[PDB]
């Protein structure tokens, strides 16, 4: 139990750090002129689709998992 929980918490923190440093890359080291038309620019182009679909997936999962738990309860 100790080893599993230890490595799981370590992994969670490291994932948060990976995303934090991706954000820092975008704020600091991202050059639109060099990265023009590549997959990085293209994924910045339609960010609203990504954010809205993450929002839908999370809303669905939360609504339904909570609803089933509450119904059973």
């Amino acid at each position: 139990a100790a080893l599993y929980t230890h490595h799981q918490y370590i992994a969670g923190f490291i994932m948060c750090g990976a995303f934090a440093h991706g954000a820092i890359f975008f704020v600091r080291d991202y050059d639109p002129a060099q990265n023009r038309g590549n997959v990085l620019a293209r994924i910045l182009d339609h960010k609203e689709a990504l954010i809205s679909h993450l929002s839908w997936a999370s809303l669905f999962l939360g609504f339904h998992t909570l609803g089933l738990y509450v119904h059973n309860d």
């Binding site: 960010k47 609203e48 954010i51 809205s52 929002s55 309860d73």
Partner: protein, 741 residues
């Protein structure tokens, strides 16, 4: 000059045009909802009558009619209570055997298996077990029939209609002028004499003629269906004479000043009735007669349309001394022109009164068979404690509001308000030192106990087994109160409460009230109470004092009472307003009252409540408060883990609902954190992405979804936090006390 009645005829026309158009009262709210913030501000500013009109006359009229509406709502509520007692309650069955039938007054329907909630309370009945103490109240009144509850409910409905009609009439047909409202001397004369005074006198008359013979016969022990109806006792002094012989002499002793002859129903006894566990109704009769006379005397002080009397202004202006400059000069003008000043005073005094009520009702149960009803005890105490705390925080909020809006420095020059505002840093500095010192010497004591217990050095921790901290002053006061009857209370036959000392009052095999001992744990919890109270008063007092200005933001009152911040400048000015001070004071009041009710619950379940086994009292928890309350682990294990066993194991029973709310409240509280840790910007950009998704499918609203304002985010967060916490404690208390006790 000369107090009189002044009204305007038909000031307002009774139409429905303004209901069709929301937001009519406020100029800013008008011109359509461009964004949802309009929808929120429509409700947030509905009763803020100050921002709808600057005329104090119109503000006062709106307040008058709103009070009538509130009275109508309260009468609807009372009518509902009495009607449910009349129809869906086992009151008539509970009267015969009040010791074994569990009070109930709400049945549920069959619709989705919720029928299980119908408890097997008793009397051949099934329903939810009420804890509002209405059965004991009705028995103390002397009801003993379900027709009388129906009559009372219908009368309360008629009176609710009367209240609503009165509100409509006094806003739309005959509305008072402003100079009517400002007759504070006449209003005080009528609220001392007419309201409280004549009300107490009328209640004493009722008890003498209804509640006293009926309850005498019930306490002697009679099936209620044979007892004469109250009008029979009232109308002939023969029956009362057989019960209370002094009624054979009539009113002649009263007008002859031979009042001692009324000693058989105007007693001074104290203590509890051994058969019911409540105060003697003769004692309460005498109490109400006495205070009715005292209030009638009090209601003649102030001057009105005749020369005799004192003036509030003259009395206030004459109390000035060397340390205060002008003293109370200008207090009269800032009390009869600002409603928020009166609201602060009245809310503070009302919350303190509610808390006093809670105390005086657990210690000295005033209704028959109410001490033995442990659920009613706990519920009534906790309810009045929470109501008092909320009212006190409201007093703080409205003191701040008055300090922001209705305070002008022209009339408040070198008077008491000016003197206080002119040295606020000293007050706040010293109050913060007191909070620090109390926090250390209250919580660090618990932490020292915890550390010594975990280290295996119980000879070092503060406890009765080691370093003692004994409440010498509280114990001395308890002893002094015990020694009163016959010494300093020569005409009192027994102590006012069996909590000072003496014997154990037990009713129906259940303890009603036994002496409460104070030791080291009681010392520690009382200092915890002092610490929490002091931090709460610090927050609210600092908000009131620095409402206007601050060395950080001198023009704060220009930003209003309720504003989020003042930019990230000066290092950050988040939550600098008075409203945010109220927002934090709510959290601290919650903490304070929660610790108070935890202390009451554990102390009563460990040192008072229990069953008498013909050889000693066997308390519910067995006395573990005296030895386990000294440590935080003791509270987490011997009170919160241990006593939660009745709520988490409630599934499939009648208390199953308390098992759901206990969980459900845990949700709401946690949900509140969403609003308290987050900020508006994240939500605005998230909503921007959501709105793009809607735009792509032509379903965007024409009303802009806007994230909640900063102030509203904080308000929603605190509302949810308080709701979740209070509901958790309420369900836990109720399930615990309805499964044991």
């Amino acid at each position: 000059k000369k107090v009189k009645i002044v009204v305007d005829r038909n000031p307002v026309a009774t139409n429905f045009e303004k209901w069709a158009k929301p937001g009519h009262f406020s100029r800013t709210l008008s011109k359509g909802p461009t964004t949802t913030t309009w929808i929120w501000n429509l409700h947030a500013d509905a009763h803020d009558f100050d921002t709808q009109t600057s005329d104090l006359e119109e503000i006062s009229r709106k307040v008058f009619s709103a009070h009538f509406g509130q009275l109508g709502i309260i009468f609807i509520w009372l009518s509902g209570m009495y009607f449910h007692g009349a129809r869906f309650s086992n009151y008539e069955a509970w009267l015969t055997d009040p010791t074994h039938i569990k009070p109930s007054a709400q049945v549920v329907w069959p619709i989705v298996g919720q029928e299980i909630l119908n408890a097997d309370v008793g009397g051949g009945f099934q329903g939810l077990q009420i804890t509002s103490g209405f059965f004991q109240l009705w028995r103390a009144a002397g009801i003993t029939s379900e027709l009388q509850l129906y009559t009372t409910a219908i009368g309360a409905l008629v009176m609710a209609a009367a209240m609503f009609f009165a509100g409509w009439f006094h806003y739309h047909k005959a509305a008072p002028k402003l100079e009517w409202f400002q007759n504070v001397e006449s209003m005080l004369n009528h609220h001392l004499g007419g309201l409280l005074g004549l009300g107490s006198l009328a209640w004493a008359g009722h008890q003498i003629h209804v509640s006293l013979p009926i309850n005498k016969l019930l306490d002697a022990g009679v099936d209620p269906k044979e007892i004469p109806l109250p009008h029979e006792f009232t109308l002939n002094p023969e029956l009362m004479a057989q019960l209370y012989p002094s009624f054979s002499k009539g009113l002649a002793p009263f007008f002859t000043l031979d009042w001692a002859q009324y000693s058989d129903f105007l007693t001074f006894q104290g203590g509890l009735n051994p058969v019911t566990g409540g105060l003697w109704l003769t004692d309460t009769v005498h109490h109400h007669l006495a205070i009715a006379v005292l209030f009638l005397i009090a209601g003649h002080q102030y001057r009105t349309n005749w020369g005799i009397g004192s003036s509030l202004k003259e009395i206030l202006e004459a109390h000035k001394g060397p340390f205060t400059g002008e003293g109370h000069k200008g207090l009269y003008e800032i009390l009869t022109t600002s409603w928020h000043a009166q609201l602060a005073i009245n809310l503070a005094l009302f919350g303190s009164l509610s808390i006093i009520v809670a105390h005086h009702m657990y210690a000295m149960p005033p209704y028959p068979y109410l001490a033995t009803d442990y659920g009613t005890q706990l519920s009534l105490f906790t309810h009045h404690m929470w109501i008092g705390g909320f009212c006190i925080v409201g007093a703080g909020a409205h003191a701040a509001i008055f300090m922001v809006r209705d305070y002008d420095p022209t009339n408040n020059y070198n008077n008491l308000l000016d003197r206080v505002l002119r040295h606020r840093d000293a007050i706040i500095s010293h109050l913060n030192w007191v909070c620090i010192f109390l926090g250390f010497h209250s919580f660090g004591l618990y932490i020292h106990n915890d550390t010594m217990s975990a280290l295996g050095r119980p000879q070092d921790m503060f406890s009765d087994t080691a370093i003692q901290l004994q409440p010498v002053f509280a114990q001395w006061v308890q002893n002094t109160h015990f020694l009163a009857p016959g010494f300093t209370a020569p005409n009192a036959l027994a102590s006012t409460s069996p909590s000072w000392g003496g014997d154990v009052v037990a009713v129906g095999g259940k303890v009603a009230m036994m002496p409460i001992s104070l030791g080291t744990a009681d010392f520690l919890v009382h200092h915890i109470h002092a610490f929490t109270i002091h931090v709460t008063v610090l927050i609210l007092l600092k908000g009131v004092l620095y409402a206007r200005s601050s060395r950080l933001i001198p023009d704060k009152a220009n930003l209003g009472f309720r504003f989020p911040c003042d930019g990230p400048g000066r290092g950050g000015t988040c939550q600098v307003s008075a409203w945010d001070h109220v927002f934090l004071g709510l959290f601290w009041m919650y903490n304070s009252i929660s610790i108070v009710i935890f202390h009451f619950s554990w102390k009563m379940q460990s040192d008072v409540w229990g069953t008498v086994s013909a050889n000693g009292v066997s308390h519910i928890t067995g006395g573990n408060f005296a030895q386990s309350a000294n440590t935080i682990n003791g509270w987490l294990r011997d009170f919160l883990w241990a006593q939660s066993s009745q709520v988490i194991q409630s599934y499939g029973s009648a208390l199953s609902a308390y098992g759901l709310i206990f969980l459900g409240a845990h949700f709401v509280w946690a949900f509140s954190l969403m609003f308290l840790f987050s900020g508006r910007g994240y939500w605005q950009e998230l909503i921007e992405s959501i709105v793009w998704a809607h735009n792509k499918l032509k379903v965007a609203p024409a009303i802009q979804p806007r994230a909640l304002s900063i102030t509203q985010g904080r308000a929603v967060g605190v509302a949810h936090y308080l709701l979740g916490g209070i509901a958790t404690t309420w369900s836990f208390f109720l399930a615990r006390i309805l499964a044991v006790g």
